[PDB]
Amino acid sequence: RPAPTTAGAGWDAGVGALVNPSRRRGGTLRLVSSADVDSLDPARTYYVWVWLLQRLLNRTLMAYPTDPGPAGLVPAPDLAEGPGEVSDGGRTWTYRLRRGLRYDDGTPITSDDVRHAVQRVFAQDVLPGGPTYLIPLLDDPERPYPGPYRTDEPLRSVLTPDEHTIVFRLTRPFSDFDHLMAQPCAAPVPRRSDTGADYGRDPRSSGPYRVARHEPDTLLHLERNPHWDRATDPIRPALPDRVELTIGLDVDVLDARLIAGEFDINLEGRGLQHAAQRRATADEVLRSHTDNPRTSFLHFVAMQPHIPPFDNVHVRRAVQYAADKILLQDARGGPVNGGDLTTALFPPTLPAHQDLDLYPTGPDLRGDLDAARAELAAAGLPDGFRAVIGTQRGKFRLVADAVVESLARVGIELTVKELDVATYFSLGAGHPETVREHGLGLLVTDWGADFPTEYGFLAPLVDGRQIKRNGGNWNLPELDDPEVNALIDETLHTTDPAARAELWRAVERRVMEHAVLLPLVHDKTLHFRNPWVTNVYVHPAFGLYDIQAMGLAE
Numbered sequence: 001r002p003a004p005t006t007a008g009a010g011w012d013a014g015v016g017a018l019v020n021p022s023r024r025r026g027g028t029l030r031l032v033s034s035a036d037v038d039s040l041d042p043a044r045t046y047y048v049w050v051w052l053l054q055r056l057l058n059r060t061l062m063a064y065p066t067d068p069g070p071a072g073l074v075p076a077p078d079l080a081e082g083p084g085e086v087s088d089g090g091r092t093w094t095y096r097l098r099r100g101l102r103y104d105d106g107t108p109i110t111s112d113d114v115r116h117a118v119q120r121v122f123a124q125d126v127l128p129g130g131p132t133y134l135i136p137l138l139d140d141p142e143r144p145y146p147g148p149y150r151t152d153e154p155l156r157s158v159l160t161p162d163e164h165t166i167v168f169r170l171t172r173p174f175s176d177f178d179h180l181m182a183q184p185c186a187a188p189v190p191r192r193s194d195t196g197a198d199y200g201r202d203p204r205s206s207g208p209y210r211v212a213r214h215e216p217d218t219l220l221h222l223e224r225n226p227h228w229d230r231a232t233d234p235i236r237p238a239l240p241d242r243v244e245l246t247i248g249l250d251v252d253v254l255d256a257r258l259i260a261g262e263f264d265i266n267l268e269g270r271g272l273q274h275a276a277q278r279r280a281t282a283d284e285v286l287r288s289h290t291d292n293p294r295t296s297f298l299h300f301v302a303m304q305p306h307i308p309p310f311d312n313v314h315v316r317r318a319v320q321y322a323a324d325k326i327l328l329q330d331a332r333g334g335p336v337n338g339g340d341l342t343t344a345l346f347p348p349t350l351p352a353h354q355d356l357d358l359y360p361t362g363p364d365l366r367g368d369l370d371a372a373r374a375e376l377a378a379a380g381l382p383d384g385f386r387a388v389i390g391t392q393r394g395k396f397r398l399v400a401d402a403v404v405e406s407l408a409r410v411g412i413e414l415t416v417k418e419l420d421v422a423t424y425f426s427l428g429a430g431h432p433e434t435v436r437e438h439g440l441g442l443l444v445t446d447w448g449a450d451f452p453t454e455y456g457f458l459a460p461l462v463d464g465r466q467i468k469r470n471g472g473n474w475n476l477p478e479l480d481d482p483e484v485n486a487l488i489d490e491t492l493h494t495t496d497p498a499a500r501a502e503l504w505r506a507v508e509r510r511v512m513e514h515a516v517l518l519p520l521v522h523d524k525t526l527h528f529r530n531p532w533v534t535n536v537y538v539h540p541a542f543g544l545y546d547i548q549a550m551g552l553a554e
């Protein structure tokens with residue numbers, strides 16, 4: 001019976017809890033996406049939803065557990081027997097592999113294959129597209145590693161004492177290393193099957209499923225991996241016999257067919273679009289099949305000290321005070337569906353999350369214009385000034401327009417520069433030269449961490465060492481405060497998680513003191529779940545349903 005005709009578990013039932021629990025194996029899970037995968041090479045994917053799909057295809061040393069609660073944020077032993085063994089003050093990480101495990105072709109998984117996967121990341125000329133956190137942590141600047149296609153000498157910082165042991169000797173302490181071991185670029189790839197640029201056409205699988213067929217822009221079918229051993233996998237229930245992804249639908253077409261029951265779940269997970277949002281949130285039966293989680297993305301405005309007059313802290317504080325947070329949230333969808341207002345940066349899933357509101361916007365949250373004008377006077381610009389805000393067409397433009405309206409009230413006169421959506425991070429707001437070319441003193445953007453920790457969340461946004469001069473830059477103000485950098489370094493060797501949280505609170509406070517980032521909202525989304533899908537929950541590390549946990553009702 002289609003969803004509109006029978007009530008489900010209830011609004012938000014899959015947020016922090018598991019809906020429709022079952023161990024029943026069998027059936028075909030019908031997934032849908034508006035977009036094709038970015039890559040089927042585990043090293044070359046960045047899409048959050050493809051990382052989710054990778055939980056079906058490939059195992060890793062550590063993986064996020066199948067848990068809707070806070071424990072879901074802590075990597076658990078997967079291919080490893082236990083969590084990474086830390087020595088040398090957070091600089092050496094040792095893992096011990098489970099024995100006798102096999103790929104889909106029946107061949108053995110060994111520590112050499114995990115080293116090979118990590119080595120492949122270095123071949124950015126052949127395998128671009130995935131995360132590269134591992135490179136600075138493992139590369140010797142005095143003796144650079146050119147990747148495994150250009151030399152057969154192994155990476156010197158990665159030891160394999162035997163077939164079931166791997167040791168990573170890092171260039172610096174790194175508290176969050178288990179998280180890097182949970183990313184798909186660290187899933188084992190045996191060198192014997194590594195076809196390099198072509199690997200995605202026929203990747204090996206260590207997970208419960210393997211690729212049966214991929215037809216670009218059309219479909220992806222997965223079948224069981226006959227060599228995966230259920231008894232050896234503490235993460236994956238592997239309930240369906242088959243997973244079939246339909247690719248390429250218009251987003252409203254997708255929502256309509258999903259709600260009609262023609263597909264079980266939206267894999268891409270961008271949420272219901274406006275039309276279906278209205279329909280679902282208004283209907284008592286449809287509400288019972290909907291979850292409204294935080295996505296852990298932050299929507300914010302960045303201000304760039306390299307673009308006068310934004311070099312002046314008082315100019316930046318004036319902007320913070322004059323922000324109409326209500327208007328800005330409304331631009332984000334927000335009378336009722338505009339995410340969650342925030343005056344700070346960390347999502348509330350992180351330990352360091354704190355009350356921090358250095359520039360309050362008045363009793364109605366619409367702006368403290370007196371405070372803003374006083375800041376403008378401090379800047380020597382009491383009547384305001386002219387500037388340019390960079391944005392994208394669409395939702396980001398409505399937000400930019402809300403900034404224009406907000407700031408006009410204190411004589412800050414903004415014009416809007418739109419930049420190409422596709423390349424916004426590579427060549428647009430994410431490229432320091434572009435920001436200078438168009439004189440973009442303000443930039444509208446959003447961000448989600450590549451792993452659910454304070455470092456993963458905040459370092460790319462504020463750490464001076466993370467400024468990407470050639471594009472893909474996420475530190476838009478190009479903040480390079482040695483005190484912030486030093487505090488971040490301290491967190492990375494601090495073993496005690498509580499002391500670590502306090503240091504991160506100091507970092508976030510210092511960042512807000514600089515006033516280079518204006519937080520707007522933490523984003524939220526509406527996911528629809530058909531009632532015959534079992535084990536549905538929003539994975540706290542992803543903000544999307546954990547597809548791999550799902551089954552089908554009898």
Ligand SMILES: NC(=[NH2+])NCCC[C@H](N)C(=O)O
Binds near residue numbers: 046048446447448449
């Ligand atoms: N694997 C992921 N978490 N992908 C989505 C986030 C990618 C990147 N941090 C961004 O905000 O654009």
